[PDB]
Design an enzyme around this catalytic site. Structure first.
Site, PDB file in Angstrom:
ATOM      1  N   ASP A 167       0.733  -1.244   0.300  1.00 33.44           N
ATOM      2  CA  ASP A 167      -0.434  -0.019  -0.055  1.00 33.44           C
ATOM      3  C   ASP A 167       1.191   1.518  -0.298  1.00 33.44           C
ATOM      4  O   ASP A 167       0.832   1.885   1.166  1.00 33.44           O
ATOM      5  CB  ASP A 167      -0.868  -0.043   1.018  1.00 33.44           C
ATOM      6  CG  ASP A 167      -1.965   1.061   1.625  1.00 33.44           C
ATOM      7  OD1 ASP A 167      -1.689   2.268   0.780  1.00 33.44           O
ATOM      8  OD2 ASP A 167      -1.647   1.501   2.750  1.00 33.44           O
ATOM      9  N   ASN A 414       6.698  -6.512   7.612  1.00 28.21           N
ATOM     10  CA  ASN A 414       5.969  -5.880   8.358  1.00 28.21           C
ATOM     11  C   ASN A 414       4.454  -6.694   7.883  1.00 28.21           C
ATOM     12  O   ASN A 414       4.715  -6.964   5.915  1.00 28.21           O
ATOM     13  CB  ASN A 414       5.629  -3.773   7.342  1.00 28.21           C
ATOM     14  CG  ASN A 414       4.450  -3.418   7.966  1.00 28.21           C
ATOM     15  OD1 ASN A 414       4.626  -2.884   8.956  1.00 28.21           O
ATOM     16  ND2 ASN A 414       3.890  -3.593   7.018  1.00 28.21           N
ATOM     17  N   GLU A 415       3.320  -7.266   8.546  1.00 28.18           N
ATOM     18  CA  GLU A 415       2.511  -7.901   7.600  1.00 28.18           C
ATOM     19  C   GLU A 415       2.949  -9.233   7.390  1.00 28.18           C
ATOM     20  O   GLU A 415       1.714  -9.427   6.563  1.00 28.18           O
ATOM     21  CB  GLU A 415       1.517  -7.070   7.396  1.00 28.18           C
ATOM     22  CG  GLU A 415       0.768  -5.569   8.677  1.00 28.18           C
ATOM     23  CD  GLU A 415      -0.298  -4.756   8.285  1.00 28.18           C
ATOM     24  OE1 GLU A 415      -1.071  -4.042   9.045  1.00 28.18           O
ATOM     25  OE2 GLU A 415      -0.235  -4.190   6.687  1.00 28.18           O
ATOM     26  N   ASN A 469       0.413  -3.975  14.479  1.00 27.29           N
ATOM     27  CA  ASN A 469      -0.475  -3.318  14.420  1.00 27.29           C
ATOM     28  C   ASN A 469      -2.338  -3.933  13.465  1.00 27.29           C
ATOM     29  O   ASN A 469      -2.832  -5.016  13.830  1.00 27.29           O
ATOM     30  CB  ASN A 469      -0.146  -3.646  12.188  1.00 27.29           C
ATOM     31  CG  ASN A 469       1.192  -3.137  12.233  1.00 27.29           C
ATOM     32  OD1 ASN A 469       2.219  -2.448  12.959  1.00 27.29           O
ATOM     33  ND2 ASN A 469       1.849  -3.403  10.871  1.00 27.29           N
ATOM     34  N   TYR A 471      -6.476  -2.327  13.134  1.00 26.22           N
ATOM     35  CA  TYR A 471      -7.326  -1.118  13.724  1.00 26.22           C
ATOM     36  C   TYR A 471      -8.456  -1.018  13.627  1.00 26.22           C
ATOM     37  O   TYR A 471      -9.316  -1.022  12.960  1.00 26.22           O
ATOM     38  CB  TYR A 471      -7.049  -0.528  11.463  1.00 26.22           C
ATOM     39  CG  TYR A 471      -6.231  -0.269  11.305  1.00 26.22           C
ATOM     40  CD1 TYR A 471      -5.756   0.747  10.953  1.00 26.22           C
ATOM     41  CD2 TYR A 471      -4.626  -1.410  11.288  1.00 26.22           C
ATOM     42  CE1 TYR A 471      -4.204   1.103  10.747  1.00 26.22           C
ATOM     43  CE2 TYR A 471      -3.703  -1.256  10.641  1.00 26.22           C
ATOM     44  CZ  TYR A 471      -3.953   0.680   9.977  1.00 26.22           C
ATOM     45  OH  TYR A 471      -2.290   1.224   9.928  1.00 26.22           O
ATOM     46  N   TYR A 475     -10.971  -0.523  10.285  1.00 23.47           N
ATOM     47  CA  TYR A 475     -11.471  -1.233   8.872  1.00 23.47           C
ATOM     48  C   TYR A 475     -12.074  -3.418   9.799  1.00 23.47           C
ATOM     49  O   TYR A 475     -12.660  -3.301   9.203  1.00 23.47           O
ATOM     50  CB  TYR A 475     -10.682  -2.897   8.759  1.00 23.47           C
ATOM     51  CG  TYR A 475      -9.396  -1.915   8.002  1.00 23.47           C
ATOM     52  CD1 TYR A 475      -9.899  -1.648   6.610  1.00 23.47           C
ATOM     53  CD2 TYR A 475      -8.098  -1.796   7.982  1.00 23.47           C
ATOM     54  CE1 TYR A 475      -8.523  -0.015   5.689  1.00 23.47           C
ATOM     55  CE2 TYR A 475      -7.223  -0.851   7.582  1.00 23.47           C
ATOM     56  CZ  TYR A 475      -7.742  -0.046   6.303  1.00 23.47           C
ATOM     57  OH  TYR A 475      -6.810   0.455   5.400  1.00 23.47           O
ATOM     58  N   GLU A 509       1.285   0.574  14.428  1.00 22.05           N
ATOM     59  CA  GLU A 509      -0.127   0.993  13.987  1.00 22.05           C
ATOM     60  C   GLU A 509      -1.215   1.330  13.972  1.00 22.05           C
ATOM     61  O   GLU A 509      -2.437  -0.282  14.635  1.00 22.05           O
ATOM     62  CB  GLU A 509      -0.157  -0.328  11.855  1.00 22.05           C
ATOM     63  CG  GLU A 509       1.279   0.689  10.953  1.00 22.05           C
ATOM     64  CD  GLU A 509       0.753  -0.292   9.853  1.00 22.05           C
ATOM     65  OE1 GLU A 509       2.329  -0.367   9.149  1.00 22.05           O
ATOM     66  OE2 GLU A 509       0.018  -0.819   9.025  1.00 22.05           O
ATOM     67  N   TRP A 554       0.182   5.762  13.037  1.00 23.87           N
ATOM     68  CA  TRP A 554      -0.075   5.555  11.357  1.00 23.87           C
ATOM     69  C   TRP A 554      -0.451   6.524  11.145  1.00 23.87           C
ATOM     70  O   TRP A 554      -2.157   6.396  10.840  1.00 23.87           O
ATOM     71  CB  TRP A 554      -0.140   4.007  10.716  1.00 23.87           C
ATOM     72  CG  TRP A 554      -0.076   4.192   9.657  1.00 23.87           C
ATOM     73  CD1 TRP A 554      -1.347   3.787   8.770  1.00 23.87           C
ATOM     74  CD2 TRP A 554       0.849   3.993   8.481  1.00 23.87           C
ATOM     75  NE1 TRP A 554      -0.748   3.473   7.955  1.00 23.87           N
ATOM     76  CE2 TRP A 554       1.200   3.279   7.860  1.00 23.87           C
ATOM     77  CE3 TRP A 554       2.508   3.557   9.630  1.00 23.87           C
ATOM     78  CZ2 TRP A 554       2.012   3.528   6.659  1.00 23.87           C
ATOM     79  CZ3 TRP A 554       3.658   3.227   8.154  1.00 23.87           C
ATOM     80  CH2 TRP A 554       3.153   3.399   7.052  1.00 23.87           C
ATOM     81  N   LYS A 573      -4.431   8.927   6.602  1.00 22.27           N
ATOM     82  CA  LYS A 573      -4.283   8.346   8.090  1.00 22.27           C
ATOM     83  C   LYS A 573      -3.327   9.032   8.665  1.00 22.27           C
ATOM     84  O   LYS A 573      -2.800   8.706   9.300  1.00 22.27           O
ATOM     85  CB  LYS A 573      -3.723   7.000   8.007  1.00 22.27           C
ATOM     86  CG  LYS A 573      -5.302   5.683   7.822  1.00 22.27           C
ATOM     87  CD  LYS A 573      -4.938   4.736   8.132  1.00 22.27           C
ATOM     88  CE  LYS A 573      -5.820   3.700   7.492  1.00 22.27           C
ATOM     89  NZ  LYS A 573      -5.434   3.126   6.140  1.00 22.27           N
TER      90      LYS A 573
END
Ligand SMILES: [Cl-]
Ligand SMILES: [Cl-]
Lengths: 594, 600
Positions: A167, A414-415, A469, A471, A475, A509, A554, A573
């Protein structure tokens, strides 16, 4: 170990350096006929292209902004005649993503990885006293054997379109400064420092690598140039009595001075005496706990893309200080070396991240990081080539950045997928390799997506501290469901608590897309008021767990992404706009972090 | 004394009403021929036009948006047969700015003043059990002989252009609801109530005006419908035992009932809701029900996307929910009387109102907001037009006061906004307005107005007439803004120190202060026009207010972004709103909420 030096260029008697920054010649190579057609000798029909910068946002038409594939740069520089008998290198801060370097017609070297320096030894072709030519063939495609990961779509005309598994816009080019440097025939190649604290006193353990056999002397100077320690040998211990320690947001820099003698080479660098240790659930800096407060960031500004400019650094640091932050994460790739240099002066703490983003096969990766869908990513036969790249990018990163006092942890992913032993086997190798390249064995970590659930994840036992991370309220159960989201958050943090791992957790994040100037009462997702309410709720959850020792929000600033239906001119964001001005929530951080 | 009733329409047996809101017929009259050409009998080439609404914002071309001059409205209504042997009126909430009413071909009446009701007696020409026709010639030009004041430019092609001496757009037309109503042949025309507090008890002094000589009884009902007082006579005292007073943001309303009796029968019945409360200035203090009150709120505008000044109840509902979340208790009807519904609802919600006659633009300048501190006198009150302006100023005052005087929410009359006062021609002008206003109000409640910076302490001649003094200051915006804001504060304090030294012993309210703020414009460090600058300007002005014992209120300018005539200093209207035009809050809206939660 590496065929070149990662050390920043300096200018003294023995070491010389000349900037190649300016306007270069540029030309796209869509049919990929450059090599066979003499482009290594000069470009046939080029345009002007600033260096450093990213090429994409200069153009006014889609095909060029979105170009994917091969493309070339060329420039010309005069070498001083006085650089005979010196070894002569080209040093690119970066070549994004891969490239072959040609000089005066000859292929010098090729490189893979678009966020770490590239060294080309041109000693045997450089003509001191004359004009020289450099020509770089670059490729900005994405795949699953190199970092960061993705894919390449061919459209109906055969033109290529980048389809990243991450992203952020696929900026590319020569994005950082480019030097040509002269070294002595016997030279300091590398060195490493580790710190021990002995009450008020301190030991600087060091090792040195040279391209030769002559004796080495190591001196350590204080801020005002006066001497405080001296040791002979390529391995040694410097005794600094009544030492002045590098502290969080209060730096002190000593100067190390490495010499080769009969004097053949001199290397000088600023270092900071400090220690980083994880005891239990605490991060100790100089034996006292620290709580990380700051932001994930990006190398990202209007027009320049990922191009380095010192003015961006200055403003970004005057904003971090205004929010009272102490820390940021170089997400999702190592930055230009100037960022760490300046973090050293300002006393900021850095989590340094290798570009291992995209290790789940998804082109809308941010809705998909909590969908629950495994993409079979570490079962595929490209994985061994990928692992070789990841380890090489970890090795080049650590070698480059290890002697900065601000760098206190390494993020190695990351992720990614973590819920199967295919990925354990992969990451175990990576950590093993990173442990060997860091002379200070500082903490190693990575950031986890929501899909890496406590019950299923195989990889968190490799981590010295755990980065999450999350949200919740964006989300997941966003908007009118935001109280469901708090519960669910607590539900998960409860399960992590129950595992009694006795290690620190850092949220790396959390955030909401926020359009500047969208106000609504009552607040709605996307408004400035919703961002504040979101943050005030995540803060309540963080503050409920003894082992949460860090919050990195983030993002620091709105940044550019692949365009799509979920992205309104990039990613909103940020707590700052892309022009570096604060939304309403920045003040929330400021107050909390005092 | 007025030739008609300002009493809001009700529907009982004795009094009936019918709404004429809808699509009316509309036609511009640029050549000014309608009367000689028979438009009084119907329009020849009309388009449809919503009523209530201002016409300007519907159109897609400039000529129609910016139209200035004569224009005509027409509709048709059926009058029920059962309204024979009633007096039948048309009641427009407002005709903006002047107009002539025609009913079935006949000139009924004319009216000057764009913001108060127009009553037209159509009893002789009405046809019940038949379909009837109303036609109105309206003119929206501005002049120096009526309110609000401006001028009228003639372009090179003959088109008229309005050039107001005020900073708001010249919306016009039929902006408020329209009724046809039936009254009895002997009717209540008017009444008035005053109050005295008697411990647990209260007195409601009153007086009634009718159109005949049958006797009056007055009843008073509590909130639950029960009788608590009764008195015969057109003048009286109602004695309420264990009164529930009307209190700020804690309202209680009685129903008053006025009957005209034919022995055992009823001829007319009027009911309005009222609220027992008293208002008095004692020294520097504003006393409501014998305790001091600090005014916190806003100057507003009747303004909204598409509708202009058109009245809608939802604009009311939203605007009051916003004022409550802000913790305000007050607002001023800048710069004209509002639709009556605004006041009715302020009564239920317990808000304090300063009612403002439209006396704005009494100083010749077309960019008049840069000029309220310029220092330049324009000899405005020595012109020979002035005696005509005075007459219609008084006339609008009498009409505002007669209409609004029985709302508990109305605690004071504002009789000017930013006129020239540094002159004896101006003292002689306003001595008459105030003397007039004193007589029309049965409660002798406080009278004031709002002063531009130009009306300095040493020069002003008009502040003696005011029971309290309202100030419009912009220190930190029009004066000494941005980098110089430190200086704007010392200048402000220097002016306040001079008001102090006069020892006038009256309360001062700040009725305007604000900064144009563009939603979404963020700068660190702040700049004039950013949201951050709005918050800082405010924190500064609060420090000044709080340094003076005699400052007893603060009405920020403006509640909401609103539409002005266009020009280089105006980026799509006025942006001094604390809310946007669509009634969401900028960052300085919580500055108010927090300050005002923790005042009194
Ligand atoms: Cl195009
Ligand atoms: Cl047009």
């Amino acid at each position: 170990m590496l065929e070149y030096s990662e050390l920043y260029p300096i200018q003294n008697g023995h070491r010389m350096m000349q900037s190649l920054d300016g306007m270069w010649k540029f030309q796209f190579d869509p049919e990929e006929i450059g090599e066979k057609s003499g482009w290594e000798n000069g470009l046939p029909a080029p345009v002007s292209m600033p260096v450093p910068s990213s090429f994409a946002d200069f153009f006014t038409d889609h095909k060029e902004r979105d170009y994917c594939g091969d493309f070339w740069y060329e420039t010309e520089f005069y070498l001083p005649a006085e650089w005979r008998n010196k070894k002569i290198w080209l040093r690119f801060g970066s070549i994004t993503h891969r490239g072959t370097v040609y000089c005066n017609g000859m292929e010098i070297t090729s490189h893979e990885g678009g966020f770490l320096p590239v060294l080309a030894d041109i000693s045997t072709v450089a003509k001191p006293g004359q004009v020289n030519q450099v020509v770089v063939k670059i490729n900005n495609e994405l795949n699953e054997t190199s970092l960061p990961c993705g894919a390449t779509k061919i459209l109906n005309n055969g033109r290529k379109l980048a389809k990243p598994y991450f992203d952020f816009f696929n900026y590319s080019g020569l994005q950082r400064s480019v030097w040509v440097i002269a070294l002595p025939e016997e030279s300091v190649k590398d060195y490493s420092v580790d710190y021990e604290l002995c009450g008020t006193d301190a030991l600087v353990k060091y090792e040195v690598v040279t391209t030769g056999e002559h004796p080495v002397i190591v001196r350590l100077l204080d801020a005002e140039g006066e001497l405080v320690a001296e040791t002979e040998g390529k391995e040694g211990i410097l005794q600094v009595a009544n030492a002045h320690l590098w502290e969080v947001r209060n730096a002190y820099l000593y100067q190390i001075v490495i010499l080769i003698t009969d004097v053949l080479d001199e290397y000088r660098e600023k270092i900071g005496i400090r220690t980083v240790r994880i005891e239990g659930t605490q991060i100790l800096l100089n034996d006292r706990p620290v709580y990380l407060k700051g932001f994930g960031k990006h190398e990202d500004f209007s027009i320049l893309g990922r191009g380095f400019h010192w003015g961006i650094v200055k403003r970004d640091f005057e904003c971090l200080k205004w929010t009272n932050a102490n820390c940021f994460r170089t997400s999702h790739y190592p930055y230009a070396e100037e960022w760490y240099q300046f973090a050293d002066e300002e006393g900021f703490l850095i989590i340094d991240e290798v570009p291992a983003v995209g290790m789940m096969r998804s082109t809308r990766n941010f809705v998909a990081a909590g969908s629950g869908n495994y993409t079979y990513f570490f079962e595929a036969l490209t994985v061994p080539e990928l692992l070789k790249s990841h380890i090489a990018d970890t090795e080049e990163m650590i070698t480059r950045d290890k002697n900065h006092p601000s760098v206190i942890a390494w993020s190695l992913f990351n992720e990614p997928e973590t819920i199967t032993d295919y990925a354990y086997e992969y990451f175990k190798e990576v950590f093993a390799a990173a442990e060997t390249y860091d002379f200070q064995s500082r903490p190693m970590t990575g950031a986890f997506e929501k899909n890496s659930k406590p019950e299923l994840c195989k990889c968190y036992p490799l981590c010295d501290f755990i980065c999450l991370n999350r949200y919740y309220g964006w989300y997941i159960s966003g908007g009118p469901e935001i109280e469901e989201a708090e519960e669910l958050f607590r539900d998960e943090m409860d399960r992590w608590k129950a595992k009694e791992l006795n290690v620190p957790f850092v949220f790396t994040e959390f955030g909401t897309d926020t359009m500047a100037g969208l106000h609504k009462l009552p607040s709605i997702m996307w408004s400035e008021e919703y961002q504040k309410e979101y943050l005030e709720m995540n803060f309540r959850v963080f503050d409920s767990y003894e082992f949460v020792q860090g919050e990195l929000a983030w993002n620091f600033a709105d940044f550019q992404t692949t365009e799509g239906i979920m992205r309104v001119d990039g990613n909103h964001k940020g707590v700052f706009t892309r022009d570096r001005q604060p939304k309403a929530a920045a003040v929330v951080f400021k107050d909390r972090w005092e």
